[model samples]
Target: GKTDPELKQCKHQCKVQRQYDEEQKEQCAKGCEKYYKEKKGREQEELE
Candidate 1:
């Protein structure tokens, strides 16, 4: 839906977007261990 060079590059998983609603999506993505290394990683991103 948006332009992201990070996901536009030659990648595979980047082709998929986090599919979910607001609260659940944030909760699911941040704690998504397979995708994000630590909660802090997404935590910092959410701040901005």
Candidate 2:
């Protein structure tokens, strides 16, 4: 019974943290994508 409670709490916290990290990563990726798109467009104009 004691082992079950401790294990459950640990697993629960790990799942919560993983969800938080995934959301953070998605936001970061979105920003990076926008930056790269803008940079690429500028570079293309210089070549032309």
Instruction: Compare the candidates by TM-score and give the number of the best one.
Output: 2
TM-score of each: 0.28, 0.33
Best by lDDT: 2
lDDT per prediction?
0.41, 0.46
Per-residue lDDT for 6-46 in model 2, tens only?
Answer: 33443345446656466665554544444453344354335
Candidate 1: stretches off by over 4 Å = 1-19, 33-36, 39-48
RMSD of every candidate to native, in Å, equals 10.1, 16.6
In candidate 2, what residue range of length 10 has the lowest lDDT sum? 1-10
